[PDB]
Amino acid sequence: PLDVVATFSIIGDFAAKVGGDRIRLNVLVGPDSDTHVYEPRPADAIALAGADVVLTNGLEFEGFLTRLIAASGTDAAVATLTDGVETMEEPAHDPHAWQAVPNAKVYVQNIAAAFCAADAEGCAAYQANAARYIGELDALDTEIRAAIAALPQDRRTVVVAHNAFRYFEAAYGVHFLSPAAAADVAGLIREIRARNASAIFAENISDTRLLEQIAREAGLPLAGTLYSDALSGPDGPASNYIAMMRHNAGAIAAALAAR
Ligand SMILES: [Zn+2]
């Protein structure tokens, strides 16, 4: 059994689909948790020390990783799953490439390659798993594109907790606003009014601080929760990547349809 560590939950779901019962999977950053602020527990160094393969996002998403690799003394092969992805410059590259379904296909192919490197005998099983999961991703990508196409182009703007959806925007044509640092909420609400934003969404990885505040001051409904950088727990509505994207796509579409 191939010993695999995935840095966070979204990647961990891809690994489970490619590897099936051939791998033993450990995921560092869990559901409803923020990788941007993650600090590795000493248990994580043990996980890395025992792994054959480490699956990471790259693009500086996991700031803790290079330290953990040296502290753990691991000799694991480290796969950067955004290898080969058309990345986007950040307002440094924007790490949230999984929000566009064609990029998730590339993640999945890089995982199969990483497993093939470490376990040649299983390569055909891994590639069969990947090709099957990639079929479901292509259909998911078609559903999302069509549902956003079925919306009038004048209401396509939603508000979110952080700038995590720029690849979704680029792929699908929904624009996202989010607060930043400081306290320029007045500037946000102005832009909310300028762009006629339909809805404010919470995020599963963040406290619903301001987002309730902004929704009141903007006079908009808090329409629900979007899953940005982490899956939900197993009995939440985003327990795997495909469920997460259909939840997000349906929640956004419902909010954009209510004028
Ligand atoms: Zn993020």
Numbering used by the authors: 26 to 116, 134 to 225, 234 to 309
What does the paper say about this structure?
In addition to dimeric membrane permease and cytosolic ATPase proteins, bacterial ABC transporters rely on periplasmic (Gram-negative) or cell surface (Gram-positive) solute binding proteins (SBP). The SBP is essential to bind the substrate with high affinity and specificity and deliver it to the membrane permease for transport into the cell. SBPs have been categorized according to structure and substrate specificity, with members of group A-I mediating transport of zinc, manganese, or iron.
In order to determine what structural features of ΔZ-Loop AztC might mediate its more rapid transfer kinetics, a crystal structure was determined for this mutant. The overall structure is very similar to that of the holo WT, with rmsd = 0.26–0.30 Å across all atoms depending on which chains are aligned. The zinc binding site is also completely superimposable. Residues 222–229 (the Z-Loop) are absent, leaving a run of four Ala residues. Electron density in this region is also somewhat weak, indicating some flexibility. The deletion shortens the loop between helices α7 and α8, preventing closure of the loop over the zinc binding site as is observed for the WT. The lack of any other significant structure changes as a result of the deletion suggest that this is the primary reason for the increase in zinc dissociation rate and transfer rate from AztD. Here we demonstrate that the rate of transfer from WT AztD to ΔZ-Loop AztC is increased approximately two-fold relative to WT AztC under the same conditions.
